[model samples]
Structure formats: structure tokens, C-alpha cells
Target chain A: SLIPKFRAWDTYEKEMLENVTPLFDDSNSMIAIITDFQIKGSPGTSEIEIGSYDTTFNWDEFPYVIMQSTGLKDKNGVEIFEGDILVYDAPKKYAHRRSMHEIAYADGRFFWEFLDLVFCQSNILYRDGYLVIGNIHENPELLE
Target chain B: SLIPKFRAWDTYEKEMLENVTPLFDDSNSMIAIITDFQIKGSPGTSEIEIGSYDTTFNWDEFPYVIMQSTGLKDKNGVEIFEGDILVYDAPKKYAHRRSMHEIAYADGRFFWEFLDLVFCQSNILYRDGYLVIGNIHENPELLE
Candidate 1:
């Protein structure tokens, strides 16, 4: 909720981008574009710029998956995002394998889940000792 | 085109509805909904009504697939919307298996595709001999 950060997964291209702010027109056409958008400078010196992105892709063919930033970082200070797989090794008590959690928004909060296990609501997420291994789009194997 | 017809696939609900119009507020929060929405009647009778749908579902958990109506119809005169799968039995020149095409908006217009073959653009889609067997949602087996 802090300033609302977003990233996008290009569903057609099967890829993820670091940042995006969706742009849409008032027309009923519902045309949309995902871009690294920003507004800079003070009110008197204000300027708006949309960084380069494929502006003409058909929305139906290239629908995007929007991922919200968790606003929390992993144990290594890496920012975590929705669809990010956070990983940590289990101690010797269990069978000694890798453990991972998938971050998503559900119920009323942004949280992490390891298969059946749903972790904290929002605040306590990054407090736990997990590292951002990779995101679900690029590193699905990390979840396995 | 044609009053901007739209239907939606409830990504979380895993089902399709007869009609939908996406709704979003002007807030920074990108809360979206797939709705059976319409504004009816003359200017004096103008009234907005959003028919029954889960209006409270979280957008991130229930993102929708918006499929626009191609303003075309199947051979049976059934109005065809996007995501519809059209089917017909091929002749002896082919293996006489089955030929089905998935409707999608690509390039500059709406078109159909069967595996590797791309057919004509918007105007000629429904003209080809095919019936609406199913959509990509409920009857994906028809594509086989």
C-alpha cells in the first residue's frame, strides 16, 4: 500500500519486467499498455516520461500479469514481489531438503505460502529468514 | 465494434460468463472487476445497474480474462465472441481428424488459428464453414 509499486509479467512473451505502470485511455476500446512510467520534477518543473516499451502489442495476444511489490525485502535486502519464490533450507530435524514459499495476494493481505502452509498476513513476512531465490516466471524450478 | 461487446473469464473462478464489462475506480488502487454491467435507456431513462457478480473479490486474486466480441457469428448464426473455439470435420484430403480453431485478436484484427494455420482477418472469420463447438475455457478438449 506504500505508494503502490507494480511489476508485470508479459504473458505472451513469457517474461517479467522490473517495473511497470499501466496506461489506459478513456475510450471504451479498453486498450492498455504496460510501461516503466514515471513523473519527475517539482510542480513548476514537472515533466512526465514513459520509458521505451512495446507500445503497440495487442492486449489480447499480450495480456500482462501485474505483480505488486511486497514493500518488504528478503533477508539479503532484496525486494520481494508477488510471484517471487522465497527459499530457505530446512534444518536437520526434517528430511533435510529445500523449503520455498510463493508470495501472493489473498484474503485481505499480501502473504507467502508453501503449498498448504499460508504464512503471516503482511508485516511479519520479511521478518522471517527467507531469501528471494527467483520469481515464478523465470525460476519456477526454485519452487520445486 | 458493435457497442464494444465484452465477456470475461473469471481467472480465479475458472469459469466464463455470458457478458462482462470491466470496472475500475480512479484511485491508485488498481482494483478491477469483471461485471455484467450496462447503462440503460434514453437520457431520461438513463440508469446504471451492475448485475449480480462477486463485487468484493480481491482483484489480484481474481484477475479476469477480457474477451471482446468479434462482432461475428458462427455458421449457426450464434453470435461469436473471442475465446470461442470453432470446429468442423475435415474432408478425406486431410486425415479426416477434426479441425478446430481458437478465436483470438492478433496482429491488426480478430482471427482464428488451428495449431500452425492462421486464417483470414476479422471480416472472414465466421464466414468459413465452422460451428461453435466450445470455447477455450470449458471445452478445451475440443481442441484435441
Candidate 2:
């Protein structure tokens, strides 16, 4: 299914954003999504314009990143974005009662790879009491 | 993490069982886990003994199968077995209002692969209100 909404991190502003449109430059060397999409032209030579809400996003000068949705939510019902780290408190019977896992996209699928070397379904982690700790870009040490 | 407990289904008996062992014959042609494991051995020539609680399971006589735990509980807090099918009611924002998915082990991980082509984390399915409709082997029609 097509994901109608998306979230992205603005590298220039160093902040997160939502409901953005991803667009590629003419050469496709740069990519950015903005809140506003406008057209300023007369015909074939018309140019497409984009802008952010309040802050400035230097996508033309700096790089930005987009995160995918897991189509799932954390313990507090917050939608889990890609690159997010989850802290799972497994049931008492499991070996790792308290552990952390990273959400990654690899081999053409989404994975909740755990530090324990054993990875199950991400949904299983979610069901077992998963809390959103941080994201990969902002908190790299959580994986360590 | 290590799974401490497991549940299985007896194909021949058409019933579910808990707390079983997974063992292979000396030739490794077949596998089964029994409730009891006792060895009657004397020196180099030893014999093995196994039994179930109620019915007889001639591992050599009938075909058997084992299913792993999903490490998740249903709305009733009952441990969900592998073959279980779930009906999920998504929140208002979701695209598919109601959907059904099967809990299966594939590619070395459990998947809540829905027929809708949108596979969600199983925990999300559990947290957003999942009801165990039936298992795959027992109720294949639910998926159809």
C-alpha cells in the first residue's frame, strides 16, 4: 500500500518534520521534501517551487534524510518511525528480560534486529512492551 | 533471547500440547518433542524412554510437528502459538479498518503477514486490539 504521509529530518535545521513531499532535482543528485509545493511559470518553462513552514531547510545546499513508517505504534501509541530504537521488556520467561532493538530496512524487509543476536518479529517486540527510546541518527549510542 | 517454554500440535491426535521437547531419531529422519524423557542405559548399550501425558504418540508410527512461541499474548493474555490467526481492528487513521493476518515463521523470523500486502509489527496488531480468530491448520477458511 502507498504511504500517503511521511516524516523527514532536516539536516540544516536539525529538526524533525511531518507531512512532507519528497522531490528530486533535475539531475536527481539531491532530494528534499517540503510542506509547500508551488508552480511559478507560464508553460513548458514553468518552474516548481517548494518551501518549509517556519524554519529554513537548506536542502539545496545540505543533505536531508527520510524515515519510513513501521505501520505500527509504540507503547504510548506513537507511530514508530524508521531508525528508531525500541526498548523491550520481555516477559519473565524470555532470556533477555530487558533489551533494545533497532528498526532497520534490509534484504528488502523491515527488521527489528536486537543486540542479543536473536531477532524475532518486530510486532512481537511491540507486543511484549516496547518503548521508543531514540532514533539512530540522533542517538547512535543506544545501539552500542 | 531464549524461549523457555513452547507449545505444539499433535498432527495425528489433532490436539494442542504444551511443554514438549524436540528430538530427532538416531538417523535424523524425523523429529518430535515429548513431555517425558528418561534414559534406561547400561554402559555403552543404553536405551531411551519417552512418553506423553494422555494419548500415545508413536513418533515412528505417525508424523508430528512443532510450533514455536510468538512471545506474545492475545487480548485474553493467553500465549499466542505460531499457527494462530489474528483479526486486527486498526485505529481511525489507518487505511485498512479491519484486517486478518497469520502468525508464521518464515525466513527465520515470525511475520504478521496480512493478505492486504501491508505487513505490520505483530505487537502493533496485538496492541491495537487483536482477536484470535483461529489457527491456519485448523481454520484455513478464515484467511480465505
Candidate 3:
């Protein structure tokens, strides 16, 4: 059957990065497998496919991966079976489209503070969300 | 007569904003007044005093202010009267604090375009009001 031939799992989209790229090709593609991402699982343990090339290159509509797994439980207490279809959401022009900082200030490390410190800090309890930093209190001492 | 002075009103108190300002010249002179604020109403008109000190220093406990024809009314045509005291379970601090940069920015009228044109705009809807100078997507492009 026709399916994606590559597994683009185990890495975050660069467009959604909050920090500067430390190294080229440091995609950390292996992290996702070792981490046992809920959906992506591990590498080598499965015959994974990342993409498929056909006459029509509907990038937006194509899944990022497909995998075939062993019909047995792994050391980590996860059942892997053959014909297990793992369909990755198609790549978008902007992977983290909703999170793009339309307005950013401070040095390059600015967006990181907003994404990691401010936004993500509050989002851990409830799902992900964004906050518009509107007017702030004038007195820093008051906050202190 | 020993009639109550004012009706009861609902407001949020988190022990943080609980401040007692001296009503008289004495440092310990605390001015306590029962004020009713509408959740939604026209500017200035939303706040109504059910009972006020007439120039004397007499203390009254709880006064009843029924739906008098002179009571305050909100923009939604809701009339606030004596026994109709409504507690603002969602009471929010109405004071708008400002950051040093924001205060200076407000005074200088500087425009920052990196933030999607969110600046220079009056945020009237904010519980604590604010203004932005330049937006990330406004006519006045900050970046060349």
C-alpha cells in the first residue's frame, strides 16, 4: 500500500525555536526515538517511513511518517505490533504558527523568556495558550 | 435613630490591596465607606454611594438603600438599588499600573513596531488600562 517512506519524528520544527541554532544539522533526530515519544515511539524498533513521493506533492496533506513494529512488548513495557500505522501531522509552512512572536524585544534571548518563562509556565496546568502582555504595573518594587 | 448607615456590597479582598488611608489628619484616621461599583456601566456613573458621611464623624453599621430612583445604573440598563446589592465575585483591581518604560514610552509617545502594531493603541477594555505605540502590522512600519 502507498504510505510515507521517512520518519521525520524525534525533532522539533526549527521555525518554532526560541533560541538561535547552536549547530548546523544538530536536528537531534535521535532524541524522539530514545525518549519514547507517546506517538513516535523509538527508532530501529520499527521499520519507519517519513515521506512518500507521488505525482502530486500535496505537502500539506501528506503525513510525516509511517511505521511497522514488532508484535511483541519492549523492555519499556510498550506493546509494538506490525502494521501499526503512525501518521505524523503534515508539515506546515510554519510549524509553530500559533506561537510565532509577532512582536519581540530585548536581545535575541527575548522570545525565549516569553515562550519558556512566561507562556509555558502558565500553560503547564492548562493546555497551551498565549498571553498578550498588555499594560504592566509601573512599580517594579510593588512586584518585588 | 439607630438605622444602618449603608447596604452591603460585594468586593474581592486578597489582603494585598487592603490599605487603610487616614480620613482625618491623624495617622490612624481610617476612612471607611461602603461603595457600590457596577460590573458594567458608563464611566464615572457606575460608582454610587449608597450612604455617605454628611460632614460629620458619626459611624453607622449597615444601612439599607433599596432600589431608589436615585441609585446608579449600568450601561446594560441594570438598576442598582438598596437590597439589590450585588457582590462582584469577579472583582478585579481597577488601577492600571505602568512599567518604567511604559510610563516613559507613554510620555514620549515613542512607537515600537516590532510588536505587531499592538502599541500606541488605547486598551480601554483592559481592567487596568494601557496604550501601545506601534503594532507589528500597522501602517507605521518601524523597520526599514
Candidate 4:
């Protein structure tokens, strides 16, 4: 399998950015995001080379959350990231015609949490028609 | 929250049925399918009353796989199930115009396993345009 790609939500910037690597601080208390990172030297003794885009993102001040790409896209063909709030059509027998759910990663895996139903990432009904209405950080009201 | 509904696939019968309760044996080595199961009496002294729909589901011969409702539907509005192979339109950036994936339960969670990428059940892009072509037991080739 290929290495997974990741993205991060920059709280300070209130924007989403891609291709950022998450690193833990010296105390391992918080996480930081690094961009344009390169590995130099041989595979066994390689050294990480921080590019010009490198910046120490403090956890307390910057407060960032790292998310992995689902490798899938919504109805509009937009890449799905963790914490994305999606609104889609659910089965009339079980839920309302149109319902909302959020994509989250927890318990070592990703799943969709709705009113009371917790659907694993693979069980989400994505083909009927869905839209990335908002994210948890930016739009929490979408869930309400 | 309301109790979640469930369904099951009878491997020997090769059919889908609803409102079937999965019961484990004394040793937890086998599973049985019971329908019309009603709880009688009080909370602590409640006794399970099995209706006429009760049947012994042998684990080895009549193996059964229970599935919970996703509260969502397919393009045709059919309830999605575990082991159900789904084919849908994926992002062109990831694969062909349309791709195939299988719904599976593993690592204590549900997820979608495709060509080489496994998406958490919540991460599965289900709203675009998906069809339940077959299941892993009878239609494993759908994934190939």
C-alpha cells in the first residue's frame, strides 16, 4: 500500500490546508503541523530537511487538528477530510428524507456519527446525493 | 435515542430478512437467528420469549452474518448491508470514473475496502451514485 496523505485544519487561520505533516512537540503534550518537509540522505540514515515552508506550529496558540484523506470524494467530487459535516439523503424507512452526519476518526478508526447511529466510514451512504455542508470546527450548527 | 433496527443475510437460504435478533450460544462460539423475540416480565427478571420465527442458526453449516441498518439507502433505495459489494462513481483523481468497493467489518469497526485502500465506514463516499451489485459470499468477483 502507498503511504497515506494528510491534511490539517489551522485554527489560527480558520482554514484547511493539505500536505502537512503532523509532528509532536518535545514534551509530547501537543501536535504541530509542518509543511514542505523532505527526507535527505539514505533510507537507513536519512535526515529530515525542513523546507522554507517550515514553521513551528504551537499547539496551544495555533491549535491544529490533523486529518487523513479518505481517498474518496463526495457527490461533487470534493476530497473528504475528517471532521467534514455531510448532509445526504437517507432511507425513508429509517431516517428522514434528508439527514445530516459528520465524519470523525476515533477508537482507532473513522466513522460517521449521526443522531444515534454510528456508521463506519465504509457504511456511509454516499452515492445517493451528498454535500460537504460544513465542518465541526467551522460549522457546528449543521449538526444541530 | 430509539433502538437501532437490524437485518441479516441467511447464507444457506441466500436471502435477506429483517427484524431478526442475533443470539450467541452459551460458550459464545455460535450465533443463532431469532425473530419476534419479545422481552417479558420486569427489567431484572425479564424472560426472553421466542416467537414461532425462532430457528437454530448453525455457525458451521448455516453460517449467518448479521448487519445493522446504515439508516441510508442505495441509489435504488435498498438498505445497505455488511458484506454487500457496492460499485459507485469515485473521484477521477483516485480511480476510474466508477469504482468498486466492499463493505466489511474488521478491527472492531466497519470500513470499505477497495483496490488497495480501505476507507472507514464513515469515510465511504456513499451519496454520489452507488449500486449494490452483490455480496462477498456470492459475488466476490464484483470486487475483482
- The candidate maximizing lDDT is 1
lDDT (tens digit, per residue) of candidate 2 on A1-144? 536566777666677777677666788643545667789988979987865543225334644677778677777777677788888755556464466777776645566763322333454454566778888777767677
- In angstroms, give how far residue A114 of model 3 lies from its true place: 13
TM-score of chain A by itself in each prediction: 0.69, 0.63, 0.17, 0.64
Error of 1 at A20 (Å): 1.1
Candidate 2 stretches with Cα past 4 Å from truth are: A1-144, B25-29, B36-50, B53-61, B89-97, B115-122, B125-127
Q: Tell me the whole-model lDDT of each prediction, alpha carbons only.
A: 0.65, 0.64, 0.26, 0.64
Residue-level lDDT tens digits of model 1 in A29-132: 32455475578999799887766555435443656767888778766677878898876633457565666777887535666663323343333333445677
Please compute DockQ, using alpha carbons, for every candidate against the native two-chain complex: 0.01, 0.03, 0.02, 0.03
**Given candidate 3, what's the lDDT at residue B24?**
34
Candidate 4: residue A74 lDDT (0-100): 70
Write one digit per residue (lDDT tens) for candidate 3, span A71-119. 2322233322222211112244555433322213232211222122321
TM-score of chain B of each: 0.67, 0.63, 0.16, 0.59
User: Candidate 1 or 4, higher DockQ?
Assistant: 4
Backbone clash pairs for candidate 2 read: A123-B121, A123-B122, A123-B123, A127-B123, B21-B33
Quality class of the docking in candidate 3, CAPRI style? incorrect
Better of 3 and 4 by DockQ: 4
